[PDB]
Amino acid sequence: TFSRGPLMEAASYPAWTQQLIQDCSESKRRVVEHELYQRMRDNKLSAKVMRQYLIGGWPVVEQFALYMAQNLTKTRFARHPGEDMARRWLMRNIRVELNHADYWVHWSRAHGVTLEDLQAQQVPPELHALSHWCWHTSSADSLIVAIAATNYAIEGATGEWSALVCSNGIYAAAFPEEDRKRAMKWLKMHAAHPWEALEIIVTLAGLNPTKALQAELRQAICKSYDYMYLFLERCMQQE
Amino acid sequence: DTFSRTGPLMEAASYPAWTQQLIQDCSESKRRVVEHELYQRMRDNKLSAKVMRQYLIGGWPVVEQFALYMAQNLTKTRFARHPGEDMARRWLMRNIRVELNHADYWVHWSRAHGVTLEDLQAQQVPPELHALSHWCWHTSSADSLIVAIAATNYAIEGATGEWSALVCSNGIYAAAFPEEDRKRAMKWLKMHADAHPWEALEIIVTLAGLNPTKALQAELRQAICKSYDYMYLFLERCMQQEKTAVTRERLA
Ligand SMILES: CCCCCCCCCCCC(=O)O
Ligand SMILES: CCCCCCCCCCCC(=O)O
Ligand SMILES: [Fe+3]
Ligand SMILES: [Fe+3]
Ligand SMILES: [Fe+3]
Ligand SMILES: [Fe+3]
């Protein structure tokens, strides 16, 4: 049984957890420090690649609350404290995504990418792998693995690359004054969820999870990062 | 707009123009899979131990779960709702049985290259190799019956009939196995090296009819090419490791 130090510090969680974070650090790093985001931050990304990024990312954003809904259907009342924690967290964070799909549409519109463009999904297959993995793990994997792959890995990495993109103001400064707030909304809203997810994962796993379970979590987390990396590499192949 | 085949099952000309157009539109995506360099090298017994291991481990999930994709699609059918749905139900109920022993045959093929059942289950391969399996589960789970059959039973089985035939086409790969191990090792390849892809196409055409919307045709084309393209992604990644493995020994 595990009960938690501060929320957003690896120290507050067990030894196997800090080792897990450590084992996933490089897979995460090459995503959150990727050249594509550095160039987006500096208003240096070509329009063609920015268009691909917004289109290719749309399925994961549009369906993100649906991944959580699928995971919610794996929960049962009072079957395990972590499960209750997950149920309550999922029931609240599905609400949180209420407008986020709309914000992505507005962001995309600011770059000339229409709703028709988002729906058409005319992008390379490297960009869709992330969405297929999210649906599969949300559909077929255990509650703990699916939360690790989607809510911990993707949301955590997304908090970091969204912050990087906004870090020096150049990107936002490129938008016309009267379009900036609406265009930057999604980035702003995403630039604590990942640590809350980890807390749920740790509670579910316990203080002494088997090596097999630690390995399953590590591999699921790194697969999410690696499909984000595959996405970004293919985008930059064009640049 | 009902479809009823009159020409031979395994000829494109027996199907409507839109179907022949679909085949044409997907032909280059198919070709670069079924003619891939990796299969020419496998045919000639050239592939490195590293890549053979990656190939056999990476392909396992799609093979192991193939009848489960078909099972999931069967749950989408209802009796007498559409002639193509009855055709799909009866075909799926028959061919789920066909896969009875194929996972075992893949295990036997893998073991002939030193890949253990434990190696298959551990799934220690690059993510480019797992994309295909994630796509297969997603389309089988969430797409329409017609799209999911196109993505799995038409695209993947069709391509697999042709690359397995290519690997077996000149006898070198098989003769390289020792006498006492060859039959068991070659079983999976021989069982797949075929009416299945054409039967799947006939079902797709029956479901779609003679004048499907352009939107449905585009959905089929994109699903079929996605299956081919994920096979291509798989093979490209393998050949990257092949070039590294062979170059290392050449320079050494
Ligand atoms: C690494 C590039 C991936 C493309 C961007 C996908 C962003 C998905 C963000 C999901 C989390 C959320 O929408 O709240
Ligand atoms: C490049 C393809 C990667 C290996 C995939 C294995 C082939 C899947 C075969 C599915 C059909 C069947 O098992 O009968
Ligand atoms: Fe969001
Ligand atoms: Fe979030
Ligand atoms: Fe088979
Ligand atoms: Fe078959």
Give the CA-based shape of chain A. Answer: globular
User: Helical amount among residues of chain A, as a percent range?
Assistant: over 70%
Instruction: Look at the helices and sheets of chain A and give the structural class.
Output: mainly alpha
- Which percent band covers the strand fraction of chain A? under 5%
| The CATH homology group name of chain A | Heme oxygenase-like
Please report the total strand number of chain A as a whole number: 0
Explain what you see:
The structure is a homodimer. The first copy, chain A, is mainly α and 239 residues long. Chain A has a single domain (1-239), classed as Heme Oxygenase, Chain A (Up-down Bundle). Helix content of chain A is 75%, strand content 0%. Chain A has 14 helices and no strands. The first copy, chain A, has helices at 15-23, 25-32, 35-41, 47-62, 64-72, 81-96, 100-109, 115-120, 125-140, 143-165, 170-173, 177-190, 193-205, 211-238. The radius of gyration of chain A is 18 Å and the shape is globular. Chain A starts with 14 loop residues before the first helix and ends with a helix. Chains A and B meet through helix 9 and helix 14 of A and helix 8 and helix 13 of B. Bound molecules: lauric acid (2 copies) and fe (iii) ion (FE) (4 copies).
